[PDB]
Amino acid sequence: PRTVSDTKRAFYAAHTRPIHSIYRRFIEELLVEIHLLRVNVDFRYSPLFALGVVTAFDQFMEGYQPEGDRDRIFHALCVAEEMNPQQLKEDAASWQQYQGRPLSQILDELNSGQPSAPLNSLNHTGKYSRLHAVGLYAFLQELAGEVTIHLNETLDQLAPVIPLPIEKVKRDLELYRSNLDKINQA
Ligand SMILES: [Hg+2]
């Protein structure tokens, strides 16, 4: 039964190389965030969570040098959170099968009640995190037809179909996109 302090300690003990100030707050924030999730007893890991973490990390770590340490940092962060970085990476990778598929097909699979894995992750209940929203956003970007042009319209199509809390998703992705647009234009 670990603590935020214990987690920060495990991360810094595993990765004793310098981390630049530009990147260090994002990493600390993500350490705390995942910690708080993973000790909620209703949180249940799934590939949607994996895709979210990989996506958010990859986005804020763009440009990081020395680039070789990006993987050491990912490893240290996973082990600090009592996760297996190989499992998170496999799970993220498992979504690649849907590249180029149309939204109609995905909705058909979800409405059948027997969606393939990891798409079935969208049904599974448990404590919701903004990282689930990030994961969902990464998955939708893979589909044919630029479905995130009108992201909220796409999310309204999913609302009757999946128990993921779509109003929370819509707001989390508005904040995610706002934050990234600011960071990118500074
Ligand atoms: Hg990780």
Author numbering: 4 to 189
What does the report in the manuscript say about this coordinate set?
Here we show that Psb29 in Synechocystis 6803, like THF1 in Arabidopsis, is important for normal accumulation of the FtsH heterocomplex involved in PSII repair. Each Psb29 subunit consists of 9 alpha helices. A search using PDBeFOLD found no known structures with greater than 70% similarity, indicating that the specific fold is novel.
If protease inhibitor was omitted, crystals were readily obtained in three crystal forms. Two of these were in P21 (designated A-P21 and B-P21) and the third in I222. The structure was solved by single-wavelength anomalous dispersion (SAD) with the A-P21 crystal form, soaked overnight with 1 mM dipotassium tetraiodomercurate (Jena Bioscience). Heavy atom sites for A-P21 were found and the structure phased using the autoSHARP pipeline. The initial model was built with Buccaneer and refined with REFMAC. Psb29 in the other crystal forms was proteolytically cleaved at the C-terminus. In the B-P21 crystal form, the new carboxy terminus at residue Ala189 is clearly visible in the electron density. It is likely that proteolytic cleavage of the C-terminal helix allows more compact higher resolution crystal lattices to form, as there is insufficient space in these lattices to accommodate the C-terminal helix observed in the P6322 crystal form.
